[PDB]
Amino acid sequence: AFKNDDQKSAYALGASLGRYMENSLKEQEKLGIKLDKDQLIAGVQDAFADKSKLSDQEIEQTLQAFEARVKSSAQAKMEKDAADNEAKGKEYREKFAKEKGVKTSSTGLVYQVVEAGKGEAPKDSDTVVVNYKGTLIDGKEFDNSYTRGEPLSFRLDGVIPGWTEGLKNIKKGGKIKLVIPPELAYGKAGVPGIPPNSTLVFDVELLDVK
Amino acid sequence: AFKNDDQKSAYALGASLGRYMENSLKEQEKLGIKLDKDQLIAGVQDAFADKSKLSDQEIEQTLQAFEARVKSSAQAKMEKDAADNEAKGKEYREKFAKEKGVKTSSTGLVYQVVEAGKGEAPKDSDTVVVNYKGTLIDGKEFDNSYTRGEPLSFRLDGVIPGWTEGLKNIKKGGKIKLVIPPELAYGKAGVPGIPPNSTLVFDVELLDVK
Numbered sequence A, B: 001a002f003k004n005d006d007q008k009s010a011y012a013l014g015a016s017l018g019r020y021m022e023n024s025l026k027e028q029e030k031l032g033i034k035l036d037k038d039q040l041i042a043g044v045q046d047a048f049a050d051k052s053k054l055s056d057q058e059i060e061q062t063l064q065a066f067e068a069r070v071k072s073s074a075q076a077k078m079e080k081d082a083a084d085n086e087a088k089g090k091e092y093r094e095k096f097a098k099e100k101g102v103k104t105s106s107t108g109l110v111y112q113v114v115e116a117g118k119g120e121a122p123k124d125s126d127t128v129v130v131n132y133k134g135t136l137i138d139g140k141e142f143d144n145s146y147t148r149g150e151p152l153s154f155r156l157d158g159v160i161p162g163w164t165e166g167l168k169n170i171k172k173g174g175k176i177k178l179v180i181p182p183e184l185a186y187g188k189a190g191v192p193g194i195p196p197n198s199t200l201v202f203d204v205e206l207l208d209v210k
Helices: A005-029 A037-048 A056-098 A161-169 B005-029 B037-048 B056-098 B161-169
Strands: A102-104 A110-115 A127-136 A141-144 A152-155 A175-180 A200-209 B102-104 B110-115 B127-136 B141-144 B152-155 B175-180 B200-209
Touching: A005 A037, A005 B005, A005 B037, A005 B056, A037 B005, A037 B037, A056 A102, A056 A110, A056 A175, A056 B005, A110 A161, A161 A175, A161 A200, B005 B037, B056 B102, B056 B110, B056 B175, B110 B161, B161 B175, B161 B200
Parallel strands: none
Antiparallel strands: A102 A110, A110 A175, A127 A141, A127 A152, A127 A200, A175 A200, B102 B110, B110 B175, B127 B141, B127 B152, B127 B200, B175 B200
């Protein structure tokens, strides 16, 4: 496959560039931007052979415009998503909060104790051990301890406020459903996997409190 | 022949990336590392098509090993340049030192008084004001006060030893050429613009001693 390092390392370096481009295409697709892949590859090949069809100024200006197009799109989408998610989330929480056995805390956390459990009331400095599933209001799973094959262990004050607050509502052996406003979660910015202003739905099983 | 932005921007993006890659190989080349360009393009193509002959894990392992090769090669080049420059400089100094009017000091500084000047001899805690031009033995100018439109002012013992010692051989109004061994200058490490073990040539005019 590879005779020596000048080959293998080259190939690796190249594959890394190829991977980078694919990743870039993926973020662009989120914005409806679908670049011409053949042209993307040809520019790489041409440049690499010192035969670019575009002058240095043209490249620079073209990229400048492109990067502005991308950022402009990205911002409008963030703006729209944020507004839409805040609204849909409020509606969702409002409806759920009315259901049998569901409660709303003074902070806006909405929760449903499924099993109370038994033992000490969890406190901020405790280590809790849990199984859990996290999904968005449309059902999209973004996190899931089961898939890693072990429960998550963490300091109660080391997670999002909705968790820090919610788990205090049960004890060891308990189970609770938490419907958390973005204000007690990842807010407007969100994080990878979690869009701006997302209400999060967690199904949690509290296995240990130590 | 670009018909639209999705074609043109993709090409520019690829070209920018290919140029980045080409420039990287150029730097590697300066260290004796000449990767196989055909394999580099095959890696780009294969990865872009999700058919890389190296898994992500293998790519990373290969690249980490490559980074260490690169740094090892960088250090090798330094050592070689350090040795070569020490030899060339010693040769330059020895020849110059035999010429009429040139002296060698106890420390190995080589110097040529052009004009004695008149007044007090510069002492360690004094401030000196000088015009000078600094060249490597091959003639490459690395510093030239005249171009700054003003002389340089400094405490005599706050600079490289070659200057500290050298300027004591003339007086205000004098001029001296200093041929300074690396040991009395920036030594094996050098500094930006001055390679390892560079003998330095300074044409100096001593304007004031205060």
